[PDB]
Write an enzyme that holds these catalytic residues in place. Structure first.
Site, PDB file in Angstrom:
ATOM      1  N   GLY A   1      62.610 -54.488  -4.828  1.00 43.60           N
ATOM      2  CA  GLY A   1      62.653 -53.065  -5.098  1.00 43.60           C
ATOM      3  C   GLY A   1      63.429 -52.323  -4.035  1.00 43.60           C
ATOM      4  O   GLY A   1      63.867 -52.916  -3.052  1.00 43.60           O
TER       5      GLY A   1
ATOM      6  N   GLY B   1      61.186 -52.579  -0.944  1.00 39.68           N
ATOM      7  CA  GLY B   1      60.583 -53.854  -0.595  1.00 39.68           C
ATOM      8  C   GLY B   1      60.337 -54.772  -1.776  1.00 39.68           C
ATOM      9  O   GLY B   1      60.635 -54.415  -2.909  1.00 39.68           O
TER      10      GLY B   1
ATOM     11  N   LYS C   1      53.665 -53.587  -4.611  1.00 37.01           N
ATOM     12  CA  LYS C   1      54.904 -53.378  -3.882  1.00 37.01           C
ATOM     13  C   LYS C   1      54.687 -53.259  -2.386  1.00 37.01           C
ATOM     14  O   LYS C   1      53.991 -52.359  -1.923  1.00 37.01           O
ATOM     15  CB  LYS C   1      55.607 -52.121  -4.394  1.00 37.01           C
ATOM     16  CG  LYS C   1      55.691 -52.056  -5.912  1.00 37.01           C
ATOM     17  CD  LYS C   1      56.632 -50.933  -6.382  1.00 37.01           C
ATOM     18  CE  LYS C   1      56.681 -50.870  -7.899  1.00 37.01           C
ATOM     19  NZ  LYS C   1      57.719 -49.931  -8.430  1.00 37.01           N
TER      20      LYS C   1
ATOM     21  N   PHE D   1      50.703 -52.629 -14.259  1.00 37.18           N
ATOM     22  CA  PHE D   1      51.719 -53.599 -14.622  1.00 37.18           C
ATOM     23  C   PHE D   1      52.186 -53.417 -16.061  1.00 37.18           C
ATOM     24  O   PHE D   1      51.372 -53.354 -16.991  1.00 37.18           O
ATOM     25  CB  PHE D   1      51.164 -55.014 -14.396  1.00 37.18           C
ATOM     26  CG  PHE D   1      52.117 -56.124 -14.760  1.00 37.18           C
ATOM     27  CD1 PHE D   1      52.074 -56.710 -16.022  1.00 37.18           C
ATOM     28  CD2 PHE D   1      53.034 -56.608 -13.829  1.00 37.18           C
ATOM     29  CE1 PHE D   1      52.928 -57.768 -16.357  1.00 37.18           C
ATOM     30  CE2 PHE D   1      53.892 -57.663 -14.150  1.00 37.18           C
ATOM     31  CZ  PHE D   1      53.839 -58.244 -15.417  1.00 37.18           C
TER      32      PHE D   1
ATOM     33  N   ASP E   1      61.192 -54.528 -18.243  1.00 35.11           N
ATOM     34  CA  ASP E   1      61.932 -53.335 -17.826  1.00 35.11           C
ATOM     35  C   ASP E   1      63.078 -53.080 -18.795  1.00 35.11           C
ATOM     36  O   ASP E   1      63.433 -53.946 -19.592  1.00 35.11           O
ATOM     37  CB  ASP E   1      62.440 -53.394 -16.366  1.00 35.11           C
ATOM     38  CG  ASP E   1      63.509 -54.462 -16.115  1.00 35.11           C
ATOM     39  OD1 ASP E   1      64.398 -54.699 -16.954  1.00 35.11           O
ATOM     40  OD2 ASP E   1      63.471 -55.044 -15.019  1.00 35.11           O
TER      41      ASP E   1
ATOM     42  N   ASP F   1      66.096 -41.625  -8.012  1.00 35.42           N
ATOM     43  CA  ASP F   1      66.741 -42.937  -8.155  1.00 35.42           C
ATOM     44  C   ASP F   1      66.385 -43.638  -9.456  1.00 35.42           C
ATOM     45  O   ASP F   1      66.092 -44.826  -9.484  1.00 35.42           O
ATOM     46  CB  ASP F   1      66.406 -43.845  -6.957  1.00 35.42           C
ATOM     47  CG  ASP F   1      67.296 -45.098  -6.897  1.00 35.42           C
ATOM     48  OD1 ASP F   1      68.499 -45.009  -7.262  1.00 35.42           O
ATOM     49  OD2 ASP F   1      66.797 -46.168  -6.481  1.00 35.42           O
TER      50      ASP F   1
ATOM     51  N   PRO G   1      67.647 -48.306 -14.993  1.00 29.49           N
ATOM     52  CA  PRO G   1      67.003 -49.200 -15.966  1.00 29.49           C
ATOM     53  C   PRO G   1      65.887 -50.048 -15.378  1.00 29.49           C
ATOM     54  O   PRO G   1      64.890 -50.315 -16.042  1.00 29.49           O
ATOM     55  CB  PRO G   1      68.170 -50.043 -16.477  1.00 29.49           C
ATOM     56  CG  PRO G   1      69.320 -49.005 -16.493  1.00 29.49           C
ATOM     57  CD  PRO G   1      69.119 -48.310 -15.149  1.00 29.49           C
ATOM     58  N   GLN G   2      66.057 -50.480 -14.130  1.00 29.70           N
ATOM     59  CA  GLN G   2      65.047 -51.314 -13.479  1.00 29.70           C
ATOM     60  C   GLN G   2      63.690 -50.648 -13.267  1.00 29.70           C
ATOM     61  O   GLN G   2      62.665 -51.347 -13.208  1.00 29.70           O
ATOM     62  CB  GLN G   2      65.567 -51.828 -12.130  1.00 29.70           C
ATOM     63  CG  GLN G   2      66.886 -52.588 -12.208  1.00 29.70           C
ATOM     64  CD  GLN G   2      68.102 -51.695 -12.020  1.00 29.70           C
ATOM     65  OE1 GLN G   2      68.438 -50.878 -12.879  1.00 29.70           O
ATOM     66  NE2 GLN G   2      68.770 -51.852 -10.882  1.00 29.70           N
ATOM     67  N   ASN G   3      63.648 -49.325 -13.123  1.00 28.14           N
ATOM     68  CA  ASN G   3      62.340 -48.701 -12.954  1.00 28.14           C
ATOM     69  C   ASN G   3      61.840 -47.948 -14.178  1.00 28.14           C
ATOM     70  O   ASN G   3      60.989 -47.067 -14.057  1.00 28.14           O
ATOM     71  CB  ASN G   3      62.249 -47.823 -11.691  1.00 28.14           C
ATOM     72  CG  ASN G   3      63.380 -46.850 -11.560  1.00 28.14           C
ATOM     73  OD1 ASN G   3      63.795 -46.212 -12.537  1.00 28.14           O
ATOM     74  ND2 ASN G   3      63.877 -46.701 -10.333  1.00 28.14           N
TER      75      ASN G   3
HETATM   76  C1  Z62 Z   1      59.925 -56.193 -14.632  1.00 27.42           C
HETATM   77  C2  Z62 Z   1      58.628 -56.301 -15.348  1.00 27.42           C
HETATM   78  C3  Z62 Z   1      57.361 -56.688 -14.620  1.00 27.42           C
HETATM   79  N1  Z62 Z   1      56.363 -55.612 -14.651  1.00 27.42           N
HETATM   80  C4  Z62 Z   1      56.473 -54.507 -13.833  1.00 27.42           C
HETATM   81  N2  Z62 Z   1      55.502 -53.561 -13.789  1.00 27.42           N
HETATM   82  C5  Z62 Z   1      55.822 -52.571 -12.939  1.00 27.42           C
HETATM   83  N3  Z62 Z   1      54.973 -51.522 -12.753  1.00 27.42           N
HETATM   84  C6  Z62 Z   1      57.080 -52.743 -12.305  1.00 27.42           C
HETATM   85  C7  Z62 Z   1      57.683 -51.889 -11.402  1.00 27.42           C
HETATM   86  O1  Z62 Z   1      57.082 -50.738 -11.052  1.00 27.42           O
HETATM   87  C8  Z62 Z   1      59.016 -52.124 -10.761  1.00 27.42           C
HETATM   88  C9  Z62 Z   1      59.931 -51.033 -10.630  1.00 27.42           C
HETATM   89  C10 Z62 Z   1      61.191 -51.229 -10.003  1.00 27.42           C
HETATM   90  C11 Z62 Z   1      61.554 -52.506  -9.503  1.00 27.42           C
HETATM   91  C12 Z62 Z   1      60.661 -53.639  -9.617  1.00 27.42           C
HETATM   92  N4  Z62 Z   1      60.997 -54.856  -9.151  1.00 27.42           N
HETATM   93  O2  Z62 Z   1      60.176 -55.903  -9.268  1.00 27.42           O
HETATM   94  O3  Z62 Z   1      62.060 -55.059  -8.607  1.00 27.42           O
HETATM   95  C13 Z62 Z   1      59.391 -53.416 -10.251  1.00 27.42           C
HETATM   96  S1  Z62 Z   1      57.825 -54.207 -12.815  1.00 27.42           S
END
Ligand code: Z62
Length: 294
Positions: free
Chosen positions: A13, A16, A33, A78, A82, A123, A126-128
């Site tokens: 992330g 971290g 995180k 969780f 994403d 920020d 797509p990743q968040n």
């Molecule tokens: C990707 C699906 C797994 N479930 C997740 N559930 C959550 N809540 C995730 C995140 O809040 C997150 C946000 C940005 C970057 C990363 N990251 O791990 O880099 C993770 S990821």
């Protein structure tokens, strides 16, 4: 760990490493995180803890802020997948329009909520943006940038995506506004439609010039005060604005008009999340279920 059981590393992330973890006492699965040193700023802990109070169906809930053994962790609900992975997975056929419309609608609701509560993301990417099997989409990490001091790069020697950065940020303006999130969301909207990043810059200047080549080099007419921005240079090439119908084909006129309002150069002219929710583009919005492969 003392209070969790790691299931696996989910990814890297901004601040971290993120892990899929199981709460030792409850058995619940969460996104844990670890925050990347000085001595864990106390202002940040208090400020981030306030975010635990945010509750909205389109915002990933921050379950806890854990400060133990002089390390800092954020515990998030969780989610299933994403938007980056979902878009990659939908590349062949593309995300259906009704689903794109539903996700955009929900994301604007999350933004409207956070912005009404004086919280910006800064920020969005797509990743968040996280989705679930029931068709909801949620934004994770709202408010972290203001609380922390986003380091130039991750201690992982990786890379930070600039593709969704608003032009005022790229021009070095150090004062953020709700408009930076509308710009990022606009970029994401375009990407869902065309199946390609709108402005995939490889550097800040390349990011800026990709924007200029598409929307035209900004000037005092469309963006009063732009020539006084910190990193503005009178030597920037002057590119003419491109036909907007070329930008996100084959999205219809309602989608194109809404996108154009989300991508205005002047943050002050950029449409607010609240006003965007009322745009004619959402007249027929529904909530389809996505085809998710987990
Ligand atoms: C990707 C699906 C797994 N479930 C997740 N559930 C959550 N809540 C995730 C995140 O809040 C997150 C946000 C940005 C970057 C990363 N990251 O791990 O880099 C993770 S990821």
């Amino acid at each position: 760990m003392e209070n969790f059981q790691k299931v696996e590393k989910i990814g890297e992330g901004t601040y971290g490493v993120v892990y899929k973890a199981r709460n030792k006492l409850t058995g619940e699965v969460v996104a844990l995180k670890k925050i990347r040193t000085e001595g864990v700023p106390s202002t940040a802990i208090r400020e981030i803890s306030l975010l635990k109070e945010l509750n909205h169906p389109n915002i990933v809930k921050l379950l806890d802020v854990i400060h133990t053994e002089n390390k800092l962790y954020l515990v998030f609900e969780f989610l299933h997948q994403d938007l980056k992975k979902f878009m990659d997975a939908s590349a062949l056929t593309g995300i259906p329009l009704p689903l794109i419309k539903s996700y955009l609608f929900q994301l604007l609701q999350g933004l409207a909520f956070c912005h009404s509560h004086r919280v910006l993301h800064r920020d969005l990417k797509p990743q968040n943006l996280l989705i679930n099997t029931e068709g909801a989409i949620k934004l994770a990490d709202f408010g972290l940038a203001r609380a922390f001091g986003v380091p130039v790069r991750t201690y992982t020697h990786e890379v930070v995506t600039l593709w969704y950065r608003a032009p005022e940020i790229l021009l070095g303006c150090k004062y953020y506004s709700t408009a930076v999130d509308i710009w990022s969301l606009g970029c994401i909207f375009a990407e869902m439609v065309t199946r390609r990043a709108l402005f995939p810059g490889d550097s800040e200047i390349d990011q800026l010039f990709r924007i200029f080549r598409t929307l035209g080099t900004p000037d005092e007419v469309v963006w009063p005060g732009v020539t006084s921005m910190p990193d503005y240079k009178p030597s920037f090439p002057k590119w003419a604005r491109q036909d907007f119908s070329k930008v996100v084909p084959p999205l219809d006129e309602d989608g194109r008009s809404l996108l154009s309002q989300m991508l205005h150069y002047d943050p002050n002219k950029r449409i607010s999340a609240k006003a965007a929710l009322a745009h004619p583009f959402f007249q027929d919005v529904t909530k389809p279920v996505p085809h998710l492969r987990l």
